[PDB]
Symmetry: D5
Subunit: 56 residues, 10 copies
């Protein structure tokens, strides 16, 4: 799996509260987290399916 | 039905206010609840259909 | 994980061609499959998120 | 529950193949069925949540 | 039309601000209202189409 | 209500089978119909809410 | 074009902050505006496509 | 407006039947057309809003 | 690519917090940003696909 | 960028016709393609945003 899948989720500085998925290496599962709307990092997926396919 | 379908809904520590479904054993129906966006428990479905099929 | 998560995907007799998720025990990942629109079995999730949470 | 919740699903004369929900009295659950796109009857819900709240 | 179609809209105790439809008997039309995310009453439809078919 | 609200539904020459709403003056309700994807007429709403507000 | 298409956008008394479209006669284009979730006026479309077809 | 807004809609070689919007210079409006799923040209918008804002 | 693709994102005076895409010339990629709901500028796409096609 | 981003799109054996995104290394852009509904490969994103972030 790509290296960025090991990064912890990053909400970023913005103020929106949107749900995104991230690969949780420890649990070996994609989980949700609140993304702020800007300055996203690589371990941030709009679609769960894409999360598990890229990082699972 | 799976045992987690008996757990009460868990909003979690996060600050988003997203609607999700959970199986209400007492009512024998899936209902909505506000999910904060992170650290979800098993009795939490994004889709009502999946809720009633897994827990109903 | 619930036992239905071990069932293979069931398209059913109907004619629609809708994408749904199912837990693929051998891959240990949820994947897509075409659902016909009726007579669904338990290993069939409208949302990938619900799939990995219930069966992952 | 309203009386229409006891009607069996009606696909209708049209040619589209859209998924809709209907209350299956015998199962006491809302399930999917393929709607043709026209001449819908009362036991036909676009949203699973609405189905179980109206008929459940 | 079902009797619940006469109830006025109920936002409920929750804090989310989601748009839902309700049948406005006086106007004989479904209209929107802000649903809080929990403890919904019968006159609350996620889909406008469902509102007008059930109550219209 | 606008005059186009009295026009009957027009599927058009195209081949897609998309659900749209149209105001059925006779029934005094918006209903669904299968739109072909092109050459739409005025009595064609992507949103049921818009149909009933514009023509209802 | 219907006369309501000339009305300026009405947010309404409610507290939700949903995006809707309205026909901006002066720009001769549909644009976005924040709808509060209740007490909507006619120049308020959930779908941009509906706005331009009804008012454009 | 960008020059591509003057191009006529291109369905492409693929077989899907998805609705998209294109700017119709003659009508000075964005309209729908059936996109095949591949080899899209510039005058092809997934969102009506983006169509009218880029080309309108 | 159109010149507006070089403009930095504009959130606008409104108070909604919706995610939109804008072309970031320096990164040569479309990214997200929080849009207020009104007074949008051209480098603002509701769909990421439209973003990269128009500006990429 | 991950290696899978260099793979060409794979429709697969299934019969559904759903649009997905893939990274087109030659064009240095994500584009659409028709996915069959099953047996997906890694260069297949349900969301354009995820595509450009993972592969762009």
């Amino acid at each position: 799996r790509p290296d960025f899948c090991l990064e912890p989720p990053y909400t970023g500085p913005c103020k929106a509260r949107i749900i995104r998925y991230f690969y949780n290496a420890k649990a070996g599962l994609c989980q949700t987290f609140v993304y702020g709307g800007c300055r996203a990092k690589r371990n941030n997926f709009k679609s769960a399916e894409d999360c598990m396919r890229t990082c699972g």
